[model samples]
Target chain A: KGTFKDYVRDRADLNKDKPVIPAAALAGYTGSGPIQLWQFLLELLTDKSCQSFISWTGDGWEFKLSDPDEVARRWGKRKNKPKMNYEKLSRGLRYYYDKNIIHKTAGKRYVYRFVCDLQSLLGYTPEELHAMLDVK
Target chain B: KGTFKDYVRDRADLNKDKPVIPAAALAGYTGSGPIQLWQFLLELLTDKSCQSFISWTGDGWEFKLSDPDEVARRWGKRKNKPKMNYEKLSRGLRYYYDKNIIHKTAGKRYVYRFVCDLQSLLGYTPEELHAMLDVKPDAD
Candidate 1:
């Protein structure tokens, strides 16, 4: 947890895309990288709650993001709601924000910073963090 | 009308930005290089009925396109809809698809493309082109 190897054996091996964006990756996104991204998003239309990449709030940031609201709205838009309206959109953001995992960015619309352990998203928990350090 | 003097002249002059992961540009996207070209997406969100940007339906090239269904669904989504579904969803796409303004990308879900004239989204129409001749017969 403290270091990359403590959790996943390697970063590059894991960060490599699924070739096809996985369904679970919907919640967090920040780019218009390629057409594959769009195809992956359109499929989420069945879920009323699913936000596509294009229709999300703060659509202005379809290139990258480090914030939760922008992340959620991007998720919302990618789910398919372009006018995502961050007020209603931030509900999803609250969960991650309260965990102290993400904090609001200074002077930005629906932007939040990532500060949590990120063990799970990266695939290792604090428990794993401890194990790696041989606390036992 | 000719060579998009109107479109070019109407182009954005002001530019503003917010400090996000990629930064939001308000004035009209900046930078000499392609950092993040998120300036404007009139293609997905713009109301075509208000300003027909693309229509390749044979003789209907000059006709106004219906509002992009994407925008409508987007509007409904932002407004909130627990009952939102593809039934009400596909309605918007039907108008343009059925009219042949834009065609599906084929064998793929939700992907679509236009036929001709309106083929190149960022290109100009022959009308605007003819007006490019700058002749008195079709004086500006």
Candidate 2:
């Protein structure tokens, strides 16, 4: 078996001809239904149109919701909850904490990091992730 | 706040104007990188192309790998682990058991179910889920 790095390099070479979709494509759920909160946030982060409301911090899994209210509104809209607000949204997000799906970025308002094993999830190293996200 | 059912009904109406993507679209990750085993399985389950390898049982989150070997091969390929086999893949899947992400359906070989809170995750009730999946709840 090759090293994880080796595998990544090889996979990259193999995928050179494949169309490059956003890393968000890596996140997939089981059924075709309503999305989880974390998934919704990721969707917003990847959608160029939603970037104004929420986008990556260009620091690992860190992301900040520029307009959390709007983000929550959109989430509520998506979930069919007319009263969807940041408070309720935050509560739902907090549930992911123990699951290691996401965590709040301390000292930062409306900031959070997806703390799951993103490496294994995305099959990319930290360097590769930063590069893909266009981090400097 | 209305009942979950009320919200679902409202959402269904609201979505009439929107294009529908599979529930898999709801399973998004944080970055563009390698996928985890569970995520990979979900990806396979949703992809029409991979149905032969793995698919939902139309009974809740349960799914079966008709071609476990091929599934392992593809998973290994995705993770860049050329030696990935069903044994190793099954080991990885077991990790989700403690996390309540997935569970093996008792008495069923190669059958598993996503035990996570799909209801809240999908904003759909069990009835809606069954209907959406076209499941005959009474069918045994």
Question: Which candidate's TM-score is highest?
Answer: 2
Task: Write model 2 residue lDDT over B47-91, tens digit each, in one string.
Answer: 665667776777777888889999999988877789989999888
lDDT tens string, model 1, A1-55?
1221222334335554222223443223322333332334322321223332222
Which whole-number lDDT from 0 to 100 does residue A70 have in model 2? 96
DockQ of candidate 1, scored on C-alphas against the true complex (2 decimals):
0.02
* lDDT of the candidates, in the order given: 0.36, 0.65
Question: Positional deviation of A28 in candidate 2, in angstroms?
Answer: 24
Q: Which runs in model 1 stand beyond 4 Å of their true positions?
A: A1-74, A80-83, A105-111, A123-136, B1-140
lDDT of 1 by residue, B22-106 (tens): 2122222223242211112222212223233223222322222234454345435543654545466556456657776545554
Error of 2 at B59 (Å): 0.7
